[PDB]
Write a protein that binds this ligand. Structure first.
Ligand SMILES: Nc1ccn([C@H]2C[C@H](O)[C@@H](COP(=O)(O)C(F)(F)P(=O)(O)OP(=O)(O)O)O2)c(=O)n1
Ligand SMILES: [Mn+2]
Ligand SMILES: [Mn+2]
Ligand code: NA
Ligand code: NA
Length: 320
DNA sequence: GTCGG
DNA sequence: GCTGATGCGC
DNA sequence: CCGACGGCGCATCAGC
């Protein structure tokens, strides 16, 4: 991109903190820095130039000073050569293996994809599936195939009950040309905030062999593996997430699920300021005393915007 | 790690 | 066996 | 200077 070099650096440091240091807030800091610099209209000639930006503090300015001067970062090269930090990092690339388990595996001597193979017995179902499709889960999904996948899920859903509304959200709804996975928001007239619709839909998607494995399943959330039908050669296996939301709560749901995650954090933060609390369900009033007010009436994504005083931004403009 | 309080 | 911590992920 | 830093769903297993 533009400052890609800098943002790649910050992103690699973020991962290290989350995975090796288990310092989630420094993970978040580094991604906020990366976020702000990514949307900066000029070419960063210096660390000080960057330090003008909110989220970019003293330490990052130095690192950026070094990066621009040296073209690399000693902190990072130190990290790539530390066997342990390198091993822990790689392992978290398996779905279902986080910092804690990656760290445990390494202290046990399990530190490569082959070692996980030998040790399948020590992995939970989710991890086993993470290994099974390790390579495929790292492949991006070209929009074209997204549109295919969409047609398959919308049709199958309609073919369980026509009152279902399924909306593909996430980077797809933001307009990305390739996505990491597919995210589907599901609604139905019989399920509101007042009121087993997800199983029905998951079962149907299984019987046409679109959904190939399950990572988790609940009253409202399904995380699993899917695959476009082949002919020719097989498509890679893809992650799919389905989320059942109550009808009258569809607009918060789809604002949430559309993201991005950084946008969601920034919005949810800049609202608590305006005296509101936005979660994936409602946008409640923040009372003076200390408790959240009742759910405010919503009929649009814009309503949530209007509610806190943020001039609208199309899904395509929420990619932070 | 950063920035408002 | 049950369940609250904890982990992983959206 | 210090400390808060968005909000929530499901699965697992240590410790009774
Ligand atoms: N920490 C998080 C993570 C996610 N989300 C919401 C906001 C997201 O829009 C939505 C999907 O998260 P996703 O895990 O599929 C994602 F982020 F990767 P996506 O944006 O979809 O881009 P892609 O999948 O191509 O990589 O959950 C959130 O609110 N908080
Ligand atoms: Mn996604
Ligand atoms: Mn997803
Ligand atoms: Na700054
Ligand atoms: Na992982």
């Amino acid at each position: 991109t533009l400052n890609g070099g800098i943002t790649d650096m910050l992103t690699e440091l973020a991962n290290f903190e989350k995975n090796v240091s288990q310092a989630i807030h420094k993970y978040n800091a580094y991604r906020k820095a990366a976020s702000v610099i990514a949307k900066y209209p000029h070419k960063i000639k210096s660390g000080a130039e960057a330090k003008k930006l909110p989220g970019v503090g003293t330490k990052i300015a130095e690192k950026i000073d070094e990066f621009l001067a040296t073209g690399k970062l000693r902190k990072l090269e130190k990290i790539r050569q530390d066997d342990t930090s390198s091993s822990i990092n790689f392992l978290t690339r398996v779905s279902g293996i986080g910092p804690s388990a990656a760290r445990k595996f390494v202290d046990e001597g399990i530190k490569t994809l082959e070692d996980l193979r030998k040790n399948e017995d020590k992995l939970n179902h989710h991890q086993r599936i993470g290994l099974k499709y390790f390579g495929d889960f790292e492949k991006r999904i070209p929009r074209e195939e997204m549109l295919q996948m969409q047609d398959i899920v919308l049709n199958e859903v309609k073919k369980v009950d026509s009152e279902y509304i399924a909306t593909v959200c996430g980077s797809f709804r933001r307009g990305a040309e390739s996505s990491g996975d597919m995210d589907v928001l599901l609604t139905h007239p019989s399920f509101t905030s007042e009121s087993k619709l997800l199983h029905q839909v998951v079962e149907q998607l299984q019987k046409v062999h679109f959904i190939t494995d399950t990572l988790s399943k609940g009253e409202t959330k399904f995380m699993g593996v899917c695959q476009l039908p082949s002919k020719e050669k097989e498509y890679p296996h893809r992650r799919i997430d389905i989320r059942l939301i109550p009808k009258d709560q569809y607009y918060c749901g789809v604002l949430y699920f559309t993201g991005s995650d950084i946008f969601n954090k920034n919005m949810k933060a800049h609202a608590l300021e305006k005296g509101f609390t936005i979660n994936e369900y409602t946008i409640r009033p923040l009372g003076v005393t200390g408790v959240a007010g009742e759910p405010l009436p919503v009929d649009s994504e814009k309503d949530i915007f209007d509610y806190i005083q943020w001039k609208y931004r199309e899904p395509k403009d929420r990619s932070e």
